[PDB]
Structure formats: C-alpha cells, structure tokens
Amino acid sequence: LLQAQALYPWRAKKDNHLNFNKNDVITVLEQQDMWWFGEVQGQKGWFPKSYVKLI
C-alpha cells in the first residue's frame, strides 16, 4: 500500500529489476538500504531507492 513516484527514469540492468519513467508510480513491496523492491503494472522488481520519492 506504500506508493512511490519516479524522479528520473530507470532502465533495468537485470531480469529482476523494474523499468520506469519519470513520474511513473510504483507500489513499494520491500525496502533495503540501497534498493527497494516494487511493482508496476503487475511486474515486480528491484530499483535503487534514490530514483523515487514517496507519495
């Protein structure tokens, strides 16, 4: 239920990363120290936390 908004685009570098653009909204599933794990359009993957701000 925690939502984050992308501040800059991020392109996946592994098969378990998310892709997204500036202003895309990501549901945050888990948070580590550098990377978060989230969901967009039913796809789940990792992305760096520095790329998003919480809504």
Binding site: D15, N16, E30, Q32, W35, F37, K44, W46
Partner: peptide, 12 residues
C-alpha cells in the same frame, strides 16, 4: 513473492 527468485536473489 517473498520466496520468489526475483526477490530472493537480490538486486546485484
């Protein structure tokens, strides 16, 4: 997804 490959493997 907690036991999923994509989660368990981590980001690196």
């Amino acid at each position: 997804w907690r036991d999923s490959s994509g989660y368990v493997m981590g980001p690196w």
